Amino acid sequence: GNNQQNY
Amino acid sequence: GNNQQNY
Amino acid sequence: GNNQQNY
Amino acid sequence: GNNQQNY
Amino acid sequence: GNNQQNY
Amino acid sequence: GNNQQNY
Amino acid sequence: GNNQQNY
Amino acid sequence: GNNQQNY
Amino acid sequence: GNNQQNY
Amino acid sequence: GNNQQNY
Amino acid sequence: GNNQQNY
Amino acid sequence: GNNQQNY
Amino acid sequence: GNNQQNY
Amino acid sequence: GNNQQNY
Amino acid sequence: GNNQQNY
Amino acid sequence: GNNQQNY
Amino acid sequence: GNNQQNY
Amino acid sequence: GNNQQNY
Lengths: 7, 7, 7, 7, 7, 7, 7, 7, 7, 7, 7, 7, 7, 7, 7, 7, 7, 7
Fold this sequence. Notes:
18 copies of one chain form a homo-oligomer. The first copy, chain A, is mainly β and 7 residues long.
């Protein structure tokens, strides 16, 4: 699906 | 499904 | 915090 | 905190 | 705390 | 605390 | 405490 | 305490 | 925080 | 099913 | 079923 | 069934 | 299903 | 924070 | 922050 | 799907 | 899909 | 899709 990554 | 990762 | 919305 | 909503 | 809602 | 709701 | 609801 | 509800 | 919306 | 992990 | 883990 | 674990 | 991980 | 909108 | 909109 | 990464 | 990276 | 990179 849609992807958001907050490192 | 949709993905959110908060490191 | 961080926000992801999948309509 | 962090938020993910899947409608 | 952290929030996930699956409608 | 942390929240998960599956409608 | 922590919350999980399965409707 | 911690909460789980299965409707 | 950071924002991603998928309409 | 749907997945939420709070480390 | 649906999964919530609070470490 | 549905799963909640509070460590 | 849909995925949220809070490290 | 940073913004991405997909209409 | 930085902005990207996809109409 | 659509991608947003915040390093 | 569409891509936004914030280094 | 469309690309924006902020170094």
